[PDB]
Amino acid sequence: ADCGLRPLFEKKSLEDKTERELLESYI
Amino acid sequence: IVEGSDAEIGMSPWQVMLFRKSPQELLCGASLISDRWVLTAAHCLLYPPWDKNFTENDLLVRIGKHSRTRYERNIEKISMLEKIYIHPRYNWRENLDRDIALMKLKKPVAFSDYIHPVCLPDRETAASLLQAGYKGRVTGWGNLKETGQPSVLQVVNLPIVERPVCKDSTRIRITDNMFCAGYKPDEGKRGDACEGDSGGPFVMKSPFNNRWYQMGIVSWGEGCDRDGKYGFYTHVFRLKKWIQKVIDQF
Ligand code: NA
């Protein structure tokens, strides 16, 4: 649906404190 | 969650608590996949060796919570269960193979800044993201240490582990319906799920579309955060067929 997109983060163009750890693991 | 930290508010809006109704107790975690369907671990509901066989009437769920105890006015929502569905090939006598369960809520919950469903992975997403070394995220109100209860939801990032390392880490027969995750002793970081976190989601944020996907369900381990051991997670995509079947039939 509209899934996996968070009101307080993705929908507000704001990065959660540690998601960059996940992104940088994806290499 | 061992060696994690406090989730931010709204960090994991698909997080669900699963309670026994009478006497009320937090039994497990779970995740929201639509306004009416909740995912969890099967042994949270049925585990005969421990005298566990809950049905719809024995349980309730809470959605949108941050603090384990304190009530959060106009934020958290409570729901009863209309139907429980265990995987028919769930193997509790051997190794918790196919440790998965679906619960249909009596009343659809309204989404909010704090209540929002997680995506289930398609084939391409699962092939791309369930790769050894790639990190996912685990959340729960379970124990902070091996037998203690957090005040707020705990969160930790953990790398997926190569299947041979997983096989050699335990004498329990693992299956392709499982994956394991955690740091090796060499990597000098720690973290793990623990007792009580079962049914919580293992999620990954897709670099292709920035959506969060649930790849796993906290299922089992031997101790928590022990060196050379890893936590084991129900492989969500491998059972997605079953999930869709159930939802479409009912
Ligand atoms: Na470990």
Tell me, yes or no, if B43 is annotated catalytic.
Answer: yes
Q: What is the nearest CA distance from B154 to chain A, expressed in angstroms?
A: 13
B22 is catalytic: no
Closest-CA distance, A6 to chain B, in angstroms, reads 7
Q: Do A7 and B10 touch (CB under 8 A)?
A: yes
User: Do residue B103 and residue B136 come from a single domain?
Assistant: no
State whether B60 and B110 are in the same domain.
Answer: yes
Residues B113 and B24 in one domain: yes
My answer on whether B100 and B63 are in the same domain is: yes
Same domain, B133 and B205: yes
Range of the domain at B221: 118-236
- Under an 8 Å CB criterion, which residues of A touch B? 1-10, 16-19, 21-23, 25-26
Do both B55 and B158 map to the same domain?
A: no
User: Is the Cβ of B189 closer than 8 Å to some Cβ of chain A?
Assistant: no
SS in 3 state form for chain B? CECCEECCCCCCCCEEEEEECCCCEEEEEEEECCCCEEEECHHHHEEHHHCEECCHHHEEEEECCCECCCCCCCCCEEEEEEEEEECCCCECCCCCECCCEEEEECCCCCCCCCCCCCECCCHHHHHHHCCCCCEEEEEECCCCCCCCCCCECEEEEEEECCHHHHHHHCCCCCCCCEEEECCCHHHCCCCECCCCCCCCEEEEECCCCCCEEEEEEEEECCCCCCCCCCEEEEECHHHHHHHHHHHHHC
